[PDB]
Amino acid sequence: SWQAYVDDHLMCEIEGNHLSAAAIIGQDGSVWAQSANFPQFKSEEITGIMSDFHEPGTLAPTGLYIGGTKYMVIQGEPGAVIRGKKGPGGVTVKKTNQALIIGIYDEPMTPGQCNMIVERLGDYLIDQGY
Amino acid sequence: SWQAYVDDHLMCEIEGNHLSAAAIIGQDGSVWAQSANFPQFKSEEITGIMSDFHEPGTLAPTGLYIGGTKYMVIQGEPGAVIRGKKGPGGVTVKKTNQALIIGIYDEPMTPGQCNMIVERLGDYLIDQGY
Numbered sequence: 001s002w003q004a005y006v007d008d009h010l011m012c013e014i015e016g017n018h019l020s021a022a023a024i025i026g027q028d029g030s031v032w033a034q035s036a037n038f039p040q041f042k043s044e045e046i047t048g049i050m051s052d053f054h055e056p057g058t059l060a061p062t063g064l065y066i067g068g069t070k071y072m073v074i075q076g077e078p079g080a081v082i083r084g085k086k087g088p089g090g091v092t093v094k095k096t097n098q099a100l101i102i103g104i105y106d107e108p109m110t111p112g113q114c115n116m117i118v119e120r121l122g123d124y125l126i127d128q129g130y
Numbered sequence: 131s132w133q134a135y136v137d138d139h140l141m142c143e144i145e146g147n148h149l150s151a152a153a154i155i156g157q158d159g160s161v162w163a164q165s166a167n168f169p170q171f172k173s174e175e176i177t178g179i180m181s182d183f184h185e186p187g188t189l190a191p192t193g194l195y196i197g198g199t200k201y202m203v204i205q206g207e208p209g210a211v212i213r214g215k216k217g218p219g220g221v222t223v224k225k226t227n228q229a230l231i232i233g234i235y236d237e238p239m240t241p242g243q244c245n246m247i248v249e250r251l252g253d254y255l256i257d258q259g260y
Binding site: 004005008009012013014015016112116120123124127 | 146
């Protein structure tokens with residue numbers, strides 16, 4: 001049950017602070033599970049993302065759009081992780097063999113807190129085949 | 131705090147499974163936090179651990195005991211992780227710069243579930259200079 005991957009793991013608490021909206025989306029674009037406050041993702045967004053993964057950098061010019069919100073594209077690992085800031089908040093998106101982990105934090109969560117939670121779980125899924 | 135990590139982070143279930151016991155522990159030997167059922171480190175136990183970390187392979191023929199319990203060494207990462215096996219149980223020792231992180235699994239929890247959960251936070255604390 002993906003849902004508990006999203007309820008009891010991405011929402012797990014590190015240094016007393018936990019994510020705001022976690023979701024596990026396929027590359028095609030279909031929500032496997034999402035957090036109660038995870039938004040609904042508008043046009044091209046999962047495919048736009050999917051082509052900063054395929055030829056990197058491409059997203060930063062236009063800017064990270066996720067539920068139509070513009071996130072400042074940050075340093076990310078080519079074709080594996082993409083990151084973004086908006087004030088004291090931002091998002092990590094880890095690429096999997098077949099999915100996209102996605103996790104949204106705000107202050108007091110630190111970016112590298114949100115990366116640890118999100119990014120490792122993907123590496124775990126990239127080994128459970130998905 | 132430290133008994134925050136252990137009982138909340140390392141005990142965060144995955145796939146419905148969470149560790150038997152976790153501990154963060156000084157490299158000298160001073161426990162910073164440990165779970166409830168976590169054993170009690172005996173004689174020359176930590177010390178051997180940091181040799182196979184510095185001279186890898188050293189502990190393995192001897193075995194590697196933790197609370198005087200027998201873990202047959204399996205393969206890990208030189209000078210980073212020590213993993214060990216006990217039927218449907220076993221243990222991972224993610225070593226940070228001056229500390230160790232340790233988790234103990236008994237199946238329905240997988241080597242890989244443990245593995246990631248311990249190594250997850252281990253690298254993290256190496257980022258916050260531990």
